[PDB]
DNA sequence: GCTTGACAAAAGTGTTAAATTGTGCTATACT
DNA sequence: CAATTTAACACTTTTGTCAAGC
């Protein structure tokens, strides 16, 4: 950088990825992979074919690939992650409104830390923390050992509400409890007609 | 087995648009150029600045200059250095440091 | 744990000796003065010579770089303090990161004329920064700092008194040491209780979580929801049994027509009669309705 | 600061890497601030001198 | 309603996320300890 | 069927005494 | 410690009320 900084640009972190994909041309990669497949006698054919599926998937439908980097994240409505006071005044709260809290904290500190111009050794660690917090918010455990918070149990992420046995894609198809219904033991009625 | 409640309560009233509260809409513009609308009651007293959806404290379009909303200035690193060093001492510090770089 | 990357990265800068700290602080101060000189002198022109301009800009850059280096070499101090306060509710690496923000303040205020080491001063700032951070961010339901301090004082006193007595004290025993009423400490204990996790499993198996079986007190009860409407009709039928002359006063008095109750005077805005006469009309209608001929029609809706 | 959506980093396959052509365990160092990467080289500008 | 013809799922850009929202969460607090009210700019802001 | 005089209880209006909340700073040395 | 919010209180204005009698 000191010797030659005017003729090259480098970066690190997700900002580098965003800058890399900003001016990335989708058509060139698709054509290169297609040509490699056409020259199939090379063993690279398999890897090129594997890549071409995703590359064409992004090449089609018009939608840009920059959606993989987030400049903003949504917040689920409160009542889907409610805070409820049980009988006796004890409060119960979902895990989500804690995960979001972390993302709100580390973000704000970053927005503070940048303002005073702290050294890169601190700002980059803050950025790493922010990205890790977001990753834990979306899919806790995809990084490695998941966050636990209180007790020694993992906190449920957003994905965990759609992934496991409990969720709106597994538990929803198992039916619902209904009103205007009852249950009772049976005895034999021999005098009854079939209907 | 155990029961609880949300932070609020429900209301059973029924009426619909047949009752109209007189309202008018104010217009705001933010720093980045986005524009927004806010319906207020005809009691008005509309504020000069409003926190819009995007999070920028936008300003009203009707007035040429909004409420000044003046605030005290921030405290910075020099301003706190000046609370412990006199300008006379800083002059001597500058002279002392200029002596070394001048040596070469 | 993946905090090891930070420990490695901060490990590439060596510690300062006693004589380097003063040099760095003095360089920072000189660079700040140089920057302020270049900023101020522009307000009235006063061109400086090119050599002096370049030398002063170099002084500015050297001061900034010395400040950065002083922060870099002292980042190692913050972790040794953060490791003490870990486990109280906030993350270890968050503790380190926000103690660093007290470290910058310590560098800002530290001076060499006092003849003391940088650590001696920076430790106080780091510790208070970590304390404030934990106080603000350690709980899902935020507790202001003074409340956190009084809660900590209660916990400290209760621990010793339990160690002595061998059992959990009654509120008055803690009050005798807090110099506040027993109900006050009982309220502080209520403020101290943390919320439980709504997603915790219930039933000794992974069948369901606690939230799946909370009965909502403020539910939309069907029988009431319809019942009210019936009353809102039945009452009308009774009011419609009167003459419009009588009915309007009641409909305006209690706000049935538009939902806003009206004072005796305001009803005269359309009726014209004085407030006392409106009261008399209200009394007449009020006595007519309460007569059994119309009471029985809707009496049992009160429950 | 921008943050990558984890679904496409740790996709198995990593759709992000397959798109922008970097292998897994390399984007991992890129994403989490463990290795620098050059985003632009001015070939014409450097060739000029 | 109920005239649905198809349901499609696709990538969401920052613009769509910013369009869905009614405002951003600027502070981490949720509810006040004393009055048990949602806080001014917290995760439970009204 | 209703106005007017006159009165007391209830409730707005503002001051301010008290309670609560936010914030900077503690200089042996400690990495 | 300063700043902010809550409440405790005195006064003013309004709301509700009784009787004369028109």
UniProtKB/Swiss-Prot annotation, chain B:
One of its GO terms (molecular function) is bacterial-type RNA polymerase core enzyme binding. It holds the Pfam family RbpA. Keywords: Antibiotic resistance, Transcription, Transcription regulation. InterPro entries: RbpA_sf, RNApol-bd_RbpA. Induction: Constitutively expressed during growth, increases slightly in stationary phase (at protein level). The keyword Transmembrane helix does not apply. One of its GO terms (biological process) is positive regulation of DNA-templated transcription. The keyword Transcription applies. Binds to RNA polymerase (RNAP), probably stimulating transcriptions from principal, but not alternative sigma factor promoters. Partially restores transcription in the presence of rifampicin (Rif) in vitro; overexpression leads to an increase in the Rif tolerance in vivo, with smaller colonies. Seems to act by removing Rif from its binding site and preventing its further binding. No longer stimulates transcription in Rif-resistant RNA polymerase (with mutations in rpoB). Belongs to the RNA polymerase-binding protein RbpA family. Monomer. Forms a complex with the RNAP catalytic core, specifically with the beta subunit (RpoB); its binding site may overlap with that of Rif. May bind free principal sigma factors. This is RNA polymerase-binding protein RbpA. The gene is rbpA.
From Swiss-Prot, chain D:
It comes from the Bacteria. The RNAP catalytic core consists of 2 alpha, 1 beta, 1 beta' and 1 omega subunit. When a sigma factor is associated with the core the holoenzyme is formed, which can initiate transcription. DNA-dependent RNA polymerase catalyzes the transcription of DNA into RNA using the four ribonucleoside triphosphates as substrates. Belongs to the RNA polymerase beta' chain family. This is DNA-directed RNA polymerase subunit beta'. It comes from Mycolicibacterium smegmatis (strain ATCC 700084 / mc(2)155). The chain holds residues 99 to 147 of 1317 of the full protein.
């Amino acid at each position: 950088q000191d010797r030659y900084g005017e003729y090259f640009t480098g970066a690190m972190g997700a900002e580098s990825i965003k800058k890399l994909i900003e001016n990335f041309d989708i058509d060139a990669e698709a054509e290169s992979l297609r040509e490699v497949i056409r020259s199939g006698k090379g063993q690279k054919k398999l890897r090129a074919l594997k890549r071409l599926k995703v590359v064409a998937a992004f090449q089609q439908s018009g939608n840009s690939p920059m959606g993989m980097v987030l400049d903003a994240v949504p917040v689920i409505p409160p009542e889907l992650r409610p805070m409820v006071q049980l009988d006796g005044g004890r409060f119960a709260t979902s895990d989500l409104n804690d995960l979001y809290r972390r993302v709100i904290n580390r973000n704000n500190r970053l927005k503070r830390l940048i303002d005073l111009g702290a050294p890169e050794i601190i700002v980059n660690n803050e950025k790493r923390m922010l990205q890790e917090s977001v990753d834990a918010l979306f899919d806790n455990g995809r990084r490695g050992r998941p966050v636990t918070g209180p007790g020694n149990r993992p906190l449920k992420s957003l994905s965990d509400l759609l992934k496991g046995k409990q969720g709106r894609f597994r538990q929803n198809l198992l039916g619902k409890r209904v009103d205007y219904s009852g249950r009772s033991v049976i005895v034999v009625g021999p005098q009854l007609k079939l209907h | 087995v155990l029961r609880g409640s949300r932070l609020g309560a429900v209301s059973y009233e029924t009426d619909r648009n047949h009752d109209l509260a007189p309202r008018q809409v104010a217009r705001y513009r933010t720093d980045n150029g986005e524009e927004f609308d806010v319906p207020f009651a005809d009691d008005a007293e509309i504020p000069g600045t409003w926190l819009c959806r995007n999070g920028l404290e936008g300003t009203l379009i009707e007035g040429d200059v909004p409420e000044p909303k003046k605030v005290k200035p921030p405290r910075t690193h020099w301003d706190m250095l000046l609370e412990r060093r006199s300008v006379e001492e800083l002059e001597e510090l500058l002279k002392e440091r200029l002596d070394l770089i001048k040596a070469k | 744990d993946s905090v090891r990357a930070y420990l490695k990265q901060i490990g590439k800068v060596a510690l300062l000796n006693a004589e380097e700290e003063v040099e760095l602080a003095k360089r920072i101060e000189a660079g700040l003065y140089a920057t302020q000189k270049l900023a101020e002198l522009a307000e009235k022109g006063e061109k400086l010579p090119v050599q002096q301009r370049r030398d002063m800009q170099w002084i500015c850059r050297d001061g900034d770089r010395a400040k950065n280096h002083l922060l870099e070499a002292n980042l190692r101090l913050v972790v040794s303090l953060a490791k003490r306060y870990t486990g109280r509710g906030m993350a270890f690496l968050d503790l380190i990161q926000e103690g660093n923000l007290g470290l910058i303040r310590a560098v800002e205020k530290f001076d060499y004329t006092k003849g003391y080491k940088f650590s001696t001063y920076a430790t106080w700032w780091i510790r208070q920064a970590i304390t404030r951070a934990m106080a603000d961010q350690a709980r899902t339901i935020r507790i202001p700092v003074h409340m956190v301090e009084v809660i900590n004082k209660l916990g400290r006193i209760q621990r010793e008194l339990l160690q002595d007595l061998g059992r959990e004290p009654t509120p008055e025993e803690l009050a005798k040491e807090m110099d506040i009423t027993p109900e006050k400490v009982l309220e502080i204990q209520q403020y101290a209780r943390e919320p439980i996790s709504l997603d915790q499993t219930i039933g000794d198996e992974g069948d369901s979580q606690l939230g799946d079986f909370i009965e909502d007190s403020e539910a939309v009860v069907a029988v009431d929801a319809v019942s009210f409407t019936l009353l809102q009709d039945q009452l009308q039928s009774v009011l419609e049994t009167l003459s419009e002359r009588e009915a309007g006063v009641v409909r305006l008095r209690f706000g049935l027509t538009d939902g806003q109750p009206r004072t005796l005077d305001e009803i005269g805005q359309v009726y014209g009669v004085t407030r006392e006469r409106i009261r008399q009309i209200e009394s007449k209608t009020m006595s007519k309705l309460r007569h059994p001929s119309r009471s029985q029609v809707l009496r049992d809706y009160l429950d | 600061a921008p943050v990558t959506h984890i679904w496409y980093f740790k996709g198995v396959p990593s759709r992000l890497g397959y798109l922008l052509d970097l292998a897994p365990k390399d984007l991992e160092k890129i994403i989490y601030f463990a290795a620098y990467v050059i985003t632009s080289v001015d070939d014409e500008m450097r060739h000029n001198e | 309603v109920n005239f649905f013809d198809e349901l499609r799922i696709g990538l969401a850009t920052a613009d769509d996320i910013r369009n869905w929202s009614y405002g951003e969460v600027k502070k981490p607090e949720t509810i006040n300890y004393r009055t048990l009210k949602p806080e001014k700019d917290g995760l439970f802001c009204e």
